[PDB]
Amino acid sequence: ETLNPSARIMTFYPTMEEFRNFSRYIAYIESQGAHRAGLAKVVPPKEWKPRASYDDIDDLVIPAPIQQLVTGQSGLFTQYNIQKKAMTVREFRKIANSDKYCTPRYSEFEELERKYWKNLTFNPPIYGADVNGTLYEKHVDEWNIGRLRTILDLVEKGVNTPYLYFGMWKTSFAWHTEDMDLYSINYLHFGEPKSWYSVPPEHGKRLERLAKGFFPGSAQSCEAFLRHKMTLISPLMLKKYGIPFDKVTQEAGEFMITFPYGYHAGFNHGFNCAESTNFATRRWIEYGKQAVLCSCRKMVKISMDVFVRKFQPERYKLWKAGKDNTVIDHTLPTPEAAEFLK
Ligand SMILES: [Zn+2]
Ligand SMILES: [Zn+2]
């Protein structure tokens, strides 16, 4: 509780030596209290690049582009997806950069953020979201989203596969926590920034109660309605109801790490491409066992049995009998962080 008591978004600048071991570096950032914010930025060393150039991807297919329609007022909004037919990056970029969809003129982010919240319900943009794939060159061994090497790999017969996100101005991701309340890594390959809002995991339940109060219909219909990733809540609305939160802008060539039960939302500044996947550490096991799941959709559900038998052998019979009353401490870093804490 002494490390990062403010639970503010921390930024890391690892050397090539530090950066070479992904799982170890996550354990390090946690020993620094990075997890408490629910979100962290990792700026990689200058010499590291996951691909030589991105000039060969015009004919890359976006199977299911989604037009994002937003309904709402006074900081509370619902976002509805409309699947459009398959489009290429070339066609997406032309639309993203056109007069109708391009980024407005702004001097500072605060101005762009004001334009976003004022106009998110108008001129619905198209998000080239959830594209199965990677932009990493096969030889890249450091922080390869396709092959991280974390303990989530134990799931051996799509939380372990990379996804691509081609953004345009005003495209957004609603408040949510990862599936099974897992960790996530996001690399911004190129283009305009992506702004993020984060709620510290220790205050996550405060946000859920706020969301439950504002949408009582959706709350009854599904035990975890925020998992539908349709709910947009403005920073002003969070302020008005005392929800502690922080904000950060991710730029091209930067990573973002989301931590278990760390609620996040955000939006794209203009044409860009992010790559993302989920991941785990020993700390996540308890979060996965205690995760409240979407009950209205036949969703991403992992069996926790293999994880409990391997990393909590003594707890197996107790947990399986339904007697495991473990209370998660959100401030506590992952067991692997011990070498950085001594
Ligand atoms: Zn996410
Ligand atoms: Zn549901």
Is 240 labelled a binding residue?
Answer: no
Task: Give the residue among 125, 113, 103 at the shortest CA–CA distance from 75.
Answer: 113
Q: Which residues are catalytic?
A: 158, 165, 176, 178, 264, 276
SS3 165: strand
Furthest CA-CA distance within the chain: 62
Amino acid identity, position 23:
S
Label the pairing between strands 39-42 and 76-83.
Answer: unpaired
How far is 263 from 132, CA to CA, in rounded Å?
23
Residue whose entry in the numeric block shows the structure tokens 């709402």: 72
How big is the CA angle at 339 (ends 14 and 179), to the nearest 5 degrees? 70
Q: Give the up-direction half-sphere exposure of residue 138: CA atoms within 13 A in the CB hemisphere.
A: 0
- Residue 4 belongs to some domain of the structure: no
Give the closest ligand to the alpha carbon of residue 220.
2
Resolution in Å, one decimal place: 2.2
How far is 168 from 267, CA to CA, in rounded Å?
9
Q: CA 156 from chain center: how many Å?
A: 23
Q: CA 229 from chain center: how many Å?
A: 11
Residue whose entry in the numeric block shows the structure tokens 């056109």: 98
Is 127 labelled a binding residue?
Answer: yes
The rounded Å distance from CA 47 to ligand 1 centre is 28
Which pairs with CB-CB distance under 8 Å and at least 24 residues apart come from 113-121? 113/195, 113/235, 116/170, 116/195, 116/267, 117/75, 117/234, 117/236, 119/170, 120/70, 120/77, 120/170, 120/172, 120/232, 120/267, 121/70, 121/71, 121/72, 121/77
- Residue 1 belongs to some domain of the structure: no
- CB atoms inside a 10 Å sphere around CB 321: 8
The rounded Å distance from CA 177 to ligand 1 centre is 6
How big is the CA angle at 209 (ends 205 and 211), to the nearest 5 degrees? 110
Solved how? X-ray
Is 116 labelled a binding residue?
Answer: no
Task: Give the residue among 139, 176, 170 at the shortest CA–CA distance from 278.
Answer: 176
Is 194 labelled a binding residue?
Answer: yes
Task: Give the residue among 101, 103, 104 at the shortest CA–CA distance from 126.
Answer: 101
- Residue 296 belongs to some domain of the structure: yes
DSSP-assigned letters across all residues of 242-291 = T---EEEEE-TT-EEEE-TT-EEEEEESSSEEEEEEEE--TTHHHHHHT-
- Residue 90 belongs to some domain of the structure: yes
Q: How many domains does the chain have?
A: 1
Q: List, in sequence order, every beta strand (DSSP E) within the chain.
A: 10-12, 39-42, 61-62, 66-73, 76-83, 87-88, 126-132, 163-167, 172-176, 183-191, 194-199, 231-233, 246-250, 255-258, 263-268, 272-279
Task: Give the residue among 89, 82, 84, 79 at the shortest CA–CA distance from 116.
Answer: 79
SS3 142: coil
Amino acid identity, position 45:
P
* Residues measured by CB to lie within 5 Å of ligand 2, the ion: 222, 294, 296-297
- With a CB cutoff of 8 Å and minimum separation 6, the contacts of 199 are 38, 175, 206, 207, 238, 243, 244, 245, 262, 263, 264
- Residue 240 belongs to some domain of the structure: yes
- With a CB cutoff of 8 Å and minimum separation 6, the contacts of 196 are 9, 39, 247, 248, 249, 250, 256, 264, 265, 266
Task: Give the residue among 123, 105, 124 at the shortest CA–CA distance from 115.
Answer: 105
- Residue 153 belongs to some domain of the structure: yes
Domain containing 305: what range?
Answer: 9-342
- With a CB cutoff of 8 Å and minimum separation 6, the contacts of 57 are 89, 135
| CATH code of residue 325 | 2.60.120.650
- With a CB cutoff of 8 Å and minimum separation 6, the contacts of 276 are 145, 162, 163, 165, 184, 185, 186, 187
Q: Give the up-direction half-sphere exposure of residue 325: CA atoms within 13 A in the CB hemisphere.
A: 1
- Residue 28 belongs to some domain of the structure: yes
- Residue 232 belongs to some domain of the structure: yes
The rounded Å distance from CA 221 to ligand 2 centre is 7
Give the alpha-carbon dihedral of 59, 136, 269, 113, to 10 degrees: 150
